Amino acid sequence: LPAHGCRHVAIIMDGNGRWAKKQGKIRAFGHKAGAKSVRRAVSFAANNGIEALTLYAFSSVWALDSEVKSLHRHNVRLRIIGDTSRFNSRLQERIRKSEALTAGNTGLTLNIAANYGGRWDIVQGVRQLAEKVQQGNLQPDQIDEEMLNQHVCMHELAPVDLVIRTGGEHRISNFLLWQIAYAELYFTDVLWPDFDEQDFEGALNAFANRE
Amino acid sequence: GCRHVAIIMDGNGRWAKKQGKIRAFGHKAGAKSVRRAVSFAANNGIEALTLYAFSSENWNRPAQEVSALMELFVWALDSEVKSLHRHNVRLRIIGDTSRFNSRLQERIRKSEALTAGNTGLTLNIAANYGGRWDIVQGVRQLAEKVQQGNLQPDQIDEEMLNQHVCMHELAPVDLVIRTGGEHRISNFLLWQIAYAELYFTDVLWPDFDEQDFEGALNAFANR
């Protein structure tokens, strides 16, 4: 266990539009600078002994194929969480191949939320339980919190210890809900493209000091 | 327009210790702070106030001990019901009261029925409540409907689950305040907080007053 105590960090990456606007640039430049900040955060987490990093791009992707070889070379295990059923069967395959490629990697596990909502996630788990009920396999009175826990996204990874939201808003915006029942919540006014290794270190040391 | 505010009322024990007093003194001051916050919300046109009976000192206690403390908390509210009712407040207890003693369960049901027709502030007191428990109680209901053959698994959506979790008749929660300095939800509302403003203050619950409540309402109006 590392000294900061944090096994799984989730981040609501907000502020790319506002970063671009401050500069008199269009939103697209913010999104490019935001991508650079993702690579930097991924590297920092891989180098500071974090088990899992889960990222939500908050709007206030086809990059996958462009970054996946780099992730694989950093020993990152990639996973997409979210409702990917309505992506075309072709995008679903390129997502599946990126997951398959990095599934044996032993470093950071990187979860990227894509068409994700915390309410959706709970409902999908409830549907898996209801199917087991309707098959006659599961009794309703056997359903408890631990059972539903074992049906939500990321249930097999360490619980989320710390949620960081950049960009100044103080809301979860239907990112993780069930999973953040006991997480430390850390809100910073730093905009996502500016959020660097020292800012990440600050959030981890804040978690260590407050835990 | 903050229509529904929820508050994690932490800090009563820490407050008593700073005052050089035993835990009970902090419970009593916490309860005074409840009366003041309910009054403030009713005077400021808030539609619904949801209060979570909570102490971080309880993290390291068995479920049965915690439930016992929650029965005491709810008993203490029994003497306040007549005045709430006169003030047109609708009182509801949310949470797992199934193993409360039967006389207290009957009093809870009586106080809820007495005030259920009231059209002023709705005051929810979350006793022996957890956000995961709340969701699972709603999931168990849907699972019974499936087993009975009255519901298809693929019919279950967010709207449907929403209708089976606490408070689905009231305005969405706009604002969650947590006093006492910790920055966590601690398994209060989960489903219902998806889009709420979260406001954390280091003020301990017994000290949280009308100016503090207005500060939180300002955070929300700005954001």
Numbering used by the authors:
A (entry chain B): 13 to 72, 90 to 240
B (entry chain A): 17 to 239
What does the paper say about this structure?
In addition, we have crystallized E. coli UPPS with the flexible loop to further investigate the large pocket-size fluctuation in our MD simulations. Crystal structures of the ligand-bound and apo form of UPPS reveal that a major pocket closure occurs upon ligand removal, from 1032 to 432 Å3 and is in good agreement with the time-averaged pocket volume (332 Å3) of the apo form obtained from the MD simulation. We also described the first complete apo E. coli UPPS structure with an intact active site. We observed an excellent agreement between the calculated average pocket volume from the apo enzyme simulation and the newly solved crystal structure. Furthermore, it appears that the active site of the apo structure opens and expands considerably upon binding of bisphosphonate ligands, shifting the population of UPPS enzymes to a markedly different conformation. The most dynamic region of UPPS is the loop comprising residues 72–82.
Undecaprenyl pyrophosphate synthase is a cis-prenyl transferase and is responsible for the condensation of eight molecules of IPP with farnesyl diphosphate to form the C55 species, undecaprenyl diphosphate. Following the condensation, undecaprenyl diphosphate is converted to Lipid I, Lipid II, and lastly, to bacterial cell wall peptidoglycans. Comparison of these crystal structures reveals that UPPS is a highly flexible protein system, showing very mobile binding pockets in the active site region.
